[PDB]
Amino acid sequence: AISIKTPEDIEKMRVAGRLAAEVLEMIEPYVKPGVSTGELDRICNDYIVNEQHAVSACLGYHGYPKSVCISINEVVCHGIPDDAKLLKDGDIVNIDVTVIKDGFHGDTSKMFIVGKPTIMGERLCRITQESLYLALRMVKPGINLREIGAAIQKFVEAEGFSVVREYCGHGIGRGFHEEPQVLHYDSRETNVVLKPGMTFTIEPMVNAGKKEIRTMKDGWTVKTKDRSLSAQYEHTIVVTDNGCEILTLRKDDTIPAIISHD
Numbered sequence: 001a002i003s004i005k006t007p008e009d010i011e012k013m014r015v016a017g018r019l020a021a022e023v024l025e026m027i028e029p030y031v032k033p034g035v036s037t038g039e040l041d042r043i044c045n046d047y048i049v050n051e052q053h054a055v056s057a058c059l060g061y062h063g064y065p066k067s068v069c070i071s072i073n074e075v076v077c078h079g080i081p082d083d084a085k086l087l088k089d090g091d092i093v094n095i096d097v098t099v100i101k102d103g104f105h106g107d108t109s110k111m112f113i114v115g116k117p118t119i120m121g122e123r124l125c126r127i128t129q130e131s132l133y134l135a136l137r138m139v140k141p142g143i144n145l146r147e148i149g150a151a152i153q154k155f156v157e158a159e160g161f162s163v164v165r166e167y168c169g170h171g172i173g174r175g176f177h178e179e180p181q182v183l184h185y186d187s188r189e190t191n192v193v194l195k196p197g198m199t200f201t202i203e204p205m206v207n208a209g210k211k212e213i214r215t216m217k218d219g220w221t222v223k224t225k226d227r228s229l230s231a232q233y234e235h236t237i238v239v240t241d242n243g244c245e246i247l248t249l250r251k252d253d254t255i256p257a258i259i260s261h262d
């Protein structure tokens with residue numbers, strides 16, 4: 001079954017979601033040429049622990065060594081912050097945050113373009129975010145997740161890009177990853193009709209080249225097989241009576257927090 005959050009639970013999710021979003025708003029100025037992904041991670045963790053009085057759900061999860069995931073260019077996901085990896089002009093970087101506050105999880109990520117942006121990097125990030133937005137605009141009770149996954153894939157592939165199959169969105173609450181699975185492509189296996197109160201994430205991973213990926217030897221880093229650029233954006237949401245509410249909205253988001261279909 002899919003857990004239907006209570007008004008009280010949803011309010012706790014709003015708090016956790018806001019905190020996650022605020023980590024991304026906070027780190028923005030630090031994402032520039034020369035900075036290491038390792039330092040970015042420490043800055044995020046100190047902020048979460050000392051200022052938000054929360055905890056990173058990533059640190060130690062399934063054995064993950066850091067507080068946030070930072071993936072650059074061809075890295076698809078789960079990039080491990082390293083003191084020796086420095087951002088450079090033109091890089092596109094995803095910082096993925098997940099905070100636990102008062103028992104509930106807030107999960108979100110965004111792409112940052114470092115230094116002078118390249119038109120393709122800028123295009124891939126924009127299209128990826130738009131694929132997330134178009135999906136969010138479809139969320140409402142009665143619709144099947146298969147439809148949303150189908151729409152994301154259709155849009156992304158129409159741009160000459162591909163959708164990563166190995167990873168998906170997920171239900172979220174007191175647990176980091178809960179049912180249901182939220183695929184970002186069409187699958188004959190998906191059959192989940194949305195209901196008010198459900199809280200989950202949408203987080204498409206899009207490759208500029210082919211969909212195939214490769215896992216490095218550190219047991220976490222995932223890259224595109226052809227080494228093409230890959231981008232991702234993620235938001236945690238709650239299904240309302242007539243649509244949804246984005247719990248991890250940021251000041252830079254170009255979409256409203258509350259999406260009504262009334």
Ligand SMILES: O=C(O)c1ccc(-c2ccccc2OC(F)(F)F)o1
Nearest residue numbers: 057058059061062064069078096107
């Ligand atoms: O956004 C997510 O759901 C996400 C990001 C990273 C992960 C993850 C999933 C399984 C094992 C480790 C993972 O990385 C981390 F521990 F950092 F959460 O899940």
Ligand SMILES: [Mn+2]
Nearest residue numbers: 096097107108
């Ligand atoms: Mn995430």
Ligand SMILES: [Mn+2]
Nearest residue numbers: 107169201203
């Ligand atoms: Mn997630």
Ligand code: NA
Nearest residue numbers: 072073075230
């Ligand atoms: Na990438």
